[PDB]
């Protein structure tokens, strides 16, 4: 019976210690009891390892049914809120109650959950799809009597509902017999609300399997969480579909947490220590950075410091209204087997905000943005591409010489003015794509050869190589010396899966992904005394690539590379004004890029 | 809560001061508002309800919570104090008002279900509208016995039958009348949301918004405004047949105020009867500005305040802006005659194109940018869709009839295969389109002005070959344009230290009102007609060109080059206000024409 068990949660309600609280022994739910009773809060996540600490019988009893303990702790709560500071007790709610997963349940994939957990407890891992836009959910429909002045309600619990033609209060009836009510949107209560699919990882299926879906419906206070395409983590009971005996479910969600970084979103919790400032303060911090970058390759000591200042980008500016970009594009022309594939599966996992995406596998429509029909509708509808998915971070095209050409004119757009501006027949807009993009390619015929010029063996329209501000240019140079260093690092990751101890540790991957959160907001300056010489060395390169017969196209846009060049270095060294000493790194790196050939 | 807010109000329209300036203390303010109402016609008082703000507390909550309760007695609040003017003239339909907001309130993604039937304020882009839409507001009924007509109010918001003829008593004969009530329309129009105020790599919404009785067809697609009005939410049915209402509602928005401030752009052609409406403070202003020496050379240099000097490109993107007069061919059966200028820049990369037409498209209304692989034949003037619902194939409008007033920018114009070039012969030239497919056969027109944007072959410019080699252009295409700026710009040690110099300056940190005042003037009150010695210095100016081009192999000329001429020579009239053209706007239009090729 459940008499005494909305007793048995009051006590525990009423009760709970806790001490993580950096205080003393303060009453976890006893001022979330009295916050609710301020209305100055909404949800409830009444966790359950916290009753599973006292009472791990009465866990075994909520995650078997589920559905009936969340509205005994929800009349529990309705009575208590009184006890601290109209007609139906539902209307006047104005609160909601949730269960966050009990640590001992394992989350199960999207394939386990089978009929045998209807209507409990489940904990499900995917990828968000078509998450759709709020709209609002009744749930108490107020109708009025106009003719005998009153006031009406019913409650809702079907996705449908027949509503009411009688005002049947007997006294309305009884005197007249006869009269309508109409409905209205004051009185009654609505409440937020979004369906949204979820899709299995295409990694945990089958090798050749089809993936299934499910359908979550968020509604309450989850809502506005998860994104499209999003690696998402829900908790929630599994309940089949009203209105022969076959029947088709839907997760009905109480909890979703964002996983992207793999473990747990710890975005908001880049906080940095003063232990950690200290190595941050350090003389040569921008140089261990760039140490701990892949450090399961060996060498490129010079690539794995400009893969760094793409993922710190530079300042970006308005003046007049005239924009100018902020960030960086490089790319890695090189020899084949030099780790350029390695390098950029890398620079994936390392950025918030990410997508990798082949030149043979992908056409120039899914890039940008496509336009799509519904067979169920007619209607056609948006649909964003790699560089729209990866809007605030990086993207990532290797086999960059092997796309098709008309696929390829699609990021020109994408590259200087960093939107996607679409006239189809079903749409006419401008979206926002404000990415970095890092490529790699292969020479001429898959290697360099010293017969053939620049700009031969690399077959780039000009127009394409202005747009990256570095392309980097590598080789697999046989030196017996330095390939008997290359074999003995390789041999030794093999054998202990490690690299060889080197001067400073690398620092983890979660760790610089905080490192550079915080590195990026500085925006400095530069100073007047300065134009002199930056403009001295702009001068000096269009003179070499005037007088040399192997120079690549050089313009006026790479002035804006020793500019936006620098703001990064002086970003990482956190001054507040870019200084003289970052300048010349600058020069040296568009130098350093090219000298593989000499 | 009626009789308390009239009051309430009133005071408010008669004792009203403002720390403020408008149409360039005259106290009453909104009292000066309603005498105007009376001087013309329009029976609107467009209110901000933000002064309302200031004046009072106590209404402004009662306008954005209660609205539609409000507003009748903000009608019939200012009815009254139209008593000033009650006997001098009476208009019929009756006074208005309006509410809105200089700034927008809302996002299209923060729309709550706790503000669903209260004022709200939000921007957009218009897609598309629809054809008017009946709406009953008074039935009228009559009988098959009695034959007698009662002509029943809809007051609530729906319509009841009597089913009593005041005579005859059959207890239901009373069939509805539809063509003798009375209807008001109604019309459907879609938003979508601007690309700044979006979230993190997402697509655009759409908000659908019902317009009403007179705001019935005050908008197009393709302008950005601030609609202001209630936002509500309708209940819908699964079956057409029972009573069975869904529980997820679904929302619009009951408009009730527009705004198209787009001073970021100059002005559109809806607004040559608000050319009337010129304080004639500023008519002095622009006719004294208009009487420099080099007013030209003045204005033209505030084009794009960030570009360096480039002089004659500039000169020949400000005429495009004037284009000669629009004669009256009607009658000598010769058809129309086009008035606007074609534009063409070639030159090497790095030399700034591509951020002109960035200029332009942001500059001009009613604008679009279009590039070379991202567009094909159909897109560009017209296609042909089957529609969803109708089953039928319907027609629609390509990019170049969208702009139709304005500039289409079409970078990237060497790349995009001679089948969809030759398409550009018909609309660029004769300023029609003519259509003859499956089930539509029609001829459109536009009044549009291409400014297209090449690179030479090779992407170099070699000077080996001969000017009508780098192009590769033919010439049944290169005649129609008017003006083919070839951009010989090399490595000028002078040059690149001046831009240089130039660019770095943009990173430390004439007016625009205006121009863009002159040019709507200029274009509502000015039509040059060519004089005797005008056109005597024409003749000649065609007879030594053809001399010219015919050896050199550059560019040959046909007599379309003479009228050429005329269009640049009197664009150059309007400039100065002349409305005649003299010798001098001769010469200068074809020193233009003749130092671009060079
Ligand atoms: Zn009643
Ligand atoms: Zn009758």
Same mark, same amino acid.
């Given at each position: 019976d459940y008499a005494l068990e909305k007793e048995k949660v009051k006590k525990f309600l009423q009760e709970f210690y806790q001490d993580?609280? #950096?205080?003393?022994?303060?009453?976890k739910y006893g001022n979330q009891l009295v916050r609710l009773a301020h209305r100055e809060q909404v949800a409830l996540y009444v966790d359950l390892d916290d009753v599973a600490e006292d009472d791990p019988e009465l866990v075994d009893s909520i995650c078997e049914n589920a559905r009936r303990y969340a509205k005994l702790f929800a009349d529990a709560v309705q009575e208590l809120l009184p006890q601290y500071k109209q007609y139906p007790a539902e209307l006047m709610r104005r609160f909601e109650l949730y269960f966050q997963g009990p640590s001992s349940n394992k989350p199960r994939v999207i394939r386990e959950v089978r009929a045998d957990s209807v209507g409990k407890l489940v904990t499900v891992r995917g990828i968000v799809t078509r998450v759709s836009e709020v709209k609002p959910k009744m749930v108490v429909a107020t109708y009025t009597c106009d003719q005998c002045g009153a006031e009406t309600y019913q409650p809702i619990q079907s996705p449908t509902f027949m509503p009411l033609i009688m005002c049947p209060s007997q006294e309305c009836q009884t005197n007249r017999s006869?009269?309508?009510?109409? &409905?209205? @949107?004051?009185?009654?209560?609505?409440?937020?609300?979004? !369906?949204?699919?979820? $899709?299995?990882?295409?990694? $945990?299926?089958?090798?050749? +399997?089809?993936?299934?879906?499910?359908?979550?419906?968020?509604?309450? !206070? +989850?809502?506005?969480?998860?994104?499209?395409?999003?690696?998402?983590?829900?908790?929630?009971?599994?309940?089949? =579909?009203?209105?022969?005996?076959?029947?088709?479910?839907?997760?009905?969600?109480?909890?979703?947490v964002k996983m992207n970084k793999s473990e747990d979103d710890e975005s908001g919790a880049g906080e940095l220590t003063r232990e950690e400032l200290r190595q941050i303060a350090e003389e040569d911090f921008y140089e261990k950075l760039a140490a701990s970058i892949?450090?399961?390759?060996?060498?490129?000591?010079?690539?794995?410091?400009?893969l760094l200042l793409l993922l710190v980008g530079g300042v970006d500016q308005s003046p007049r209204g005239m924009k100018i970009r902020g960030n960086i594009n490089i790319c890695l022309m090189g020899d084949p087997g030099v780790a350029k594939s390695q390098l950029l599966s890398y620079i994936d996992r390392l950025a918030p905000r990410s997508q990798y995406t082949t030149g043979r596998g992908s056409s120039g429509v899914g890039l940008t943005a496509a336009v799509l029909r519904d067979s169920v509708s007619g209607e056609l509808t948006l649909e964003g591409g790699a560089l729209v998915l990866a809007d605030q971070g990086v993207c990532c095209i290797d086999e960059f010489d092997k796309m098709a050409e008309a696929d390829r004119t699609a990021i020109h757009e994408v590259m200087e003015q960093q939107t996607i501006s679409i006239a189809k027949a079903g749409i006419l807009t401008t979206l926002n794509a404000r990415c970095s993009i890092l490529a790699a390619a292969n020479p001429a015929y898959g290697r360099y050869n010293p017969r053939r010029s620049l700009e031969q063996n690399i077959q780039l329209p000009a127009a394409l190589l202005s747009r990256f501000d570095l392309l980097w240019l590598i080789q697999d140079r046989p030196d017996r010396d330095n390939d008997l260093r290359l074999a003995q690092h390789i041999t030794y990751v093999h054998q202990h899966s490690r690299q060889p101890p080197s001067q400073f540790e690398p620092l983890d991957m979660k760790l610089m992904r905080r490192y550079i959160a915080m590195c990026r907001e500085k925006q400095p300056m530069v100073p007047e005394s300065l134009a002199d010489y930056i403009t001295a060395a702009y001068v000096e390169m269009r003179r070499e690539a005037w007088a040399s017969k192997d120079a690549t196209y050089t313009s006026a846009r790479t002035l804006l590379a020793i500019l936006r060049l620098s703001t990064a270095l002086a970003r990482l060294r956190m001054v507040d004004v870019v200084e003289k000493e970052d300048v010349n790194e600058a020069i040296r790196l568009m130098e350093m890029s090219k000298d593989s050939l000499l | 809560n009626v009789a308390a807010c009239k009051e309430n109000f009133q005071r408010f329209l008669q004792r009203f001061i403002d720390p403020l300036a408008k149409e360039e203390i005259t106290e009453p303010l909104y009292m000066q508002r309603l005498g105007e109402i009376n001087v013309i016609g329009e029976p609107f008082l467009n209110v901000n309800c933000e002064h309302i703000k200031s004046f009072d507390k106590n209404l402004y909550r009662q306008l954005i919570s209660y609205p539609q309760e409000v507003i009748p007695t903000f009608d019939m609040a200012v009815n009254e104090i139209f008593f000033d003017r009650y006997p001098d003239s009476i208009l019929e339909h009756q006074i208005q008002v309006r509410p809105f907001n200089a700034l927008k309130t809302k996002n299209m993604r923060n729309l709550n279900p706790e503000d669903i039937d209260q004022l709200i304020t939000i921007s957009g882009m218009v897609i598309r509208t629809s054809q008017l839409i009946p709406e009953?507001?008074?039935?009228?009924?009559? *009988?098959?016995?009695?034959?007698?007509?009662?002509?029943?109010?809809?007051?609530?918001?729906?319509?009841? !039958?009597?089913?009593? *003829?005041?005579?005859?008593?059959?207890?239901?004969?009373?069939?509805? =009348?539809?063509?003798?009530?009375?209807?008001?329309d109604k019309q459907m129009i879609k938003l979508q949301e601007s690309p700044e105020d979006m979230p993190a790599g997402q697509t655009p919404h759409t908000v659908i918004l019902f317009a009403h009785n007179d705001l019935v067809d005050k908008v197009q697609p393709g302008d950005r405004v601030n609609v202001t009005g209630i936002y509500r939410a309708v209940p819908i049915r699964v079956n057409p047949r029972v009573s069975n209402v869904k529980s997820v509602y679904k929302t619009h928005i009951d408009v009730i105020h527009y705004r198209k401030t787009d001073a970021k752009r100059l002005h559109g052609l809806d607004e040559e009867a608000e050319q009337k409406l010129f304080s004639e403070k500023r008519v002095e202003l622009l006719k004294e500005l208009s009487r420099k020496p080099d007013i030209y050379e003045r204005l033209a240099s505030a084009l794009a305040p960030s570009?360096?000097?480039?002089?004659?490109?500039?000169?020949?993107? #400000?005429?495009?802006?004037?284009?000669?007069?629009?004669?009256?061919?009607?009658?000598?059966?010769?058809?129309?005659?086009?008035?606007?200028? +074609?534009?063409?820049?070639?030159?090497?990369?790095?030399?700034?194109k591509s951020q002109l037409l960035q200029y332009?498209?942001? #500059?001009?209304?009613?604008?679009?940018?279009?590039?070379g692989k991202g567009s094909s034949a159909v897109g560009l003037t017209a296609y042909v869709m089957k529609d969803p619902e109708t089953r039928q194939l319907v027609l629609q409008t390509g990019a170049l009839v969208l702009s139709d007033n304005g500039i289409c920018c079409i970078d990237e114009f060497d790349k995009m295969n001679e089948s969809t070039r030759?398409?550009?012969?018909?609309?660029?030239?004769? $300023?029609?389109?003519?259509?003859?497919?499956?089930?539509?056969? *029609?001829?459109?027109?536009?009044?549009?002005?291409?400014?297209?944007?090449?690179?030479? =072959?090779?992407?170099?410019? +070699?000077?080996?070959? @001969?000017?009508?080699?780098?192009?590769?252009?033919?010439?049944?295409?290169?005649?129609?344009?008017?003006?083919?700026?070839?951009?010989?710009?090399?490595?000028?040690?002078?040059?690149?230290?001046?831009?240089?110099?130039?660019?770095?300056?943009?990173?430390?940190?004439?007016?625009?009102?205006?121009?863009?005042?002159?040019?709507?003037?200029?274009?509502?009150?000015?039509?040059?007609?060519?004089?005797?010695?005008?056109?005597?210095?024409?003749?000649?100016?065609?007879?030594?060109?053809?001399?010219?081009?015919?050896?050199?192999?550059?560019?040959?000329?046909?007599?379309?080059?003479?009228?050429? &001429? =005329?269009?640049?020579?009197?664009?150059?009239?309007?400039?100065? #206000?002349?409305?005649?053209?003299?010798?001098i706007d001769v010469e200068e239009a074809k020193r233009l024409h003749r130092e671009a090729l060079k």
């Open positions: 993580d609280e #950096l205080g003393k022994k303060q009453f006869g009269g309508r009510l109409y &409905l209205q @949107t004051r009185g009654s209560r609505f409440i937020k609300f979004q !369906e949204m699919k979820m $899709q299995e990882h295409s990694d $945990q299926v089958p090798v050749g +399997n089809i993936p299934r879906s499910i359908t979550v419906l968020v509604e309450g !206070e +989850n809502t506005r969480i998860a994104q499209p395409g999003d690696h998402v983590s829900v908790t929630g009971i599994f309940l089949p =579909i009203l209105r022969g005996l076959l029947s088709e479910t839907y997760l009905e969600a109480h909890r979703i892949a450090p399961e390759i060996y060498g490129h000591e010079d690539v794995k410091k400009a | 009953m507001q008074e039935a009228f009924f009559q *009988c098959q016995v009695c034959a007698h007509t009662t002509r029943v109010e809809m007051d609530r918001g729906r319509i009841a !039958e009597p089913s009593v *003829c005041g005579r005859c008593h059959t207890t239901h004969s009373m069939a509805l =009348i539809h063509n003798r009530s009375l209807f008001s570009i360096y000097e480039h002089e004659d490109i500039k000169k020949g993107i #400000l005429l495009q802006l004037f284009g000669g007069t629009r004669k009256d061919f009607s009658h000598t059966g010769r058809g129309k005659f086009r008035a606007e200028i +074609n534009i063409l820049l070639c030159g090497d990369p790095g030399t700034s332009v498209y942001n #500059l001009v209304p009613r604008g679009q940018y279009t590039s030759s398409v550009l012969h018909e609309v660029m030239e004769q $300023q029609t389109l003519s259509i003859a497919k499956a089930g539509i056969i *029609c001829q459109l027109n536009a009044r549009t002005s291409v400014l297209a944007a090449a690179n030479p =072959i090779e992407s170099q410019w +070699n000077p080996k070959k @001969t000017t009508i080699e780098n192009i590769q252009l033919p010439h049944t295409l290169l005649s129609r344009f008017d003006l083919i700026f070839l951009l010989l710009d090399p490595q000028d040690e002078a040059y690149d230290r001046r831009l240089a110099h130039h660019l770095v300056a943009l990173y430390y940190q004439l007016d625009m009102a205006v121009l863009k005042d002159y040019i709507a003037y200029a274009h509502s009150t000015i039509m040059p007609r060519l004089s005797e010695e005008a056109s005597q210095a024409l003749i000649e100016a065609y007879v030594d060109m053809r001399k010219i081009g015919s050896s050199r192999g550059m560019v040959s000329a046909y007599p379309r080059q003479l009228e050429s &001429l =005329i269009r640049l020579a009197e664009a150059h009239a309007k400039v100065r #206000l002349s409305n005649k053209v003299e010798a």
